[PDB]
Amino acid sequence: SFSGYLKLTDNVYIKNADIVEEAKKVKPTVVVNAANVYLKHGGGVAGALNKATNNAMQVESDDYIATNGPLKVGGSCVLSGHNLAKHCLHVVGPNVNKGEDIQLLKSAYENFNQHEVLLAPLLSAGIFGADPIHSLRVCVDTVRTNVYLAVFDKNLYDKLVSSF
Ligand SMILES: O=C(O)C[C@H](NC(=O)c1ncnc2[nH]ccc12)c1ccncc1
């Protein structure tokens, strides 16, 4: 049910799209959230996904952290996808604006290999501070399952494709 994507490799596809809009249209099995270790969904992809769930994602997430404690940078957890997807895979990429090791980006993308197909943003891009061109290269060289990347900014989408 994914439409309008450019095929980059055997298993990686890309589109200039808002991941919230894409999730509402497709209702994929798995939508990836660009999470932090506390699952505090304030801004970027996380704030936008949570707002689309009317804060139900944040209520679930606070219960998960109260039981389990914080995630690791490079780690993930599977929670409900609410009205957007069957499941949400909350993945923590390194936040360069907090000095986290960029080598943890490969560990973050490895989480995707546990799911046959996913709708995802570029990890560690945007407010997480990493170079999005580097993030796409790590995605292509790490993920083996079918990944549909939604890139919000058109200028960044055109740069990612032209330099691929
Ligand atoms: O995809 C990018 O362009 C990087 C980053 N992306 C996201 O924050 C992002 N990516 C995909 N769907 C989204 N919905 C809401 C946010 C969101 C960015 C968004 C805007 N301005 C700057 C960066």
Amino acid code (one letter) for 73: V
Within-domain flag for 64? yes
Contact (CB, 8 A) for 134 and 93: no
Which CATH number is 75's domain given? 3.40.220.10
Q: How many residues does the chain have?
A: 164
Per-residue H/E/C for 126-156: HHHCCCHHHHHHHHHHHCCCEEEEEECCHHH
33 is a domain residue: yes
Query: How far out from the chain centre does Cα 143 lie?
Result: 13
How far apart, in whole angstroms, are the C-alpha atoms of residue 119 and residue 72?
A: 22
| Nearest-CA residue for atom 19 of ligand 1 | 152
β-pairing verdict for 12-16 and 30-34: unpaired
Residue 45 in contact with ligand 1 by CB distance below 6 A: yes
Name the residue range of residue 82's domain.
6-161
Q: Are 135 and 105 in contact (CB under 8 A)?
A: yes
Calpha distance 100→122 (Å, rounded): 17
Tell me how far apart the alpha carbons of residues 55 and 57 are, in angstroms, rounded to a whole number: 5
CA 124 – ligand 1 centroid, Å: 11
Which residue, judged by its Cα, is nearest atom 18 of ligand 1? Answer: 126
* Beta-carbon contacts of residue 80 (< 8 Å; ≥ 6 apart): 56, 57, 60, 87, 88
Ligand 1 pocket test, candidate residues 152, 154, 161, most atoms within 8 A of CB: 152
Asked if residue 1 is part of any domain, the answer here is no
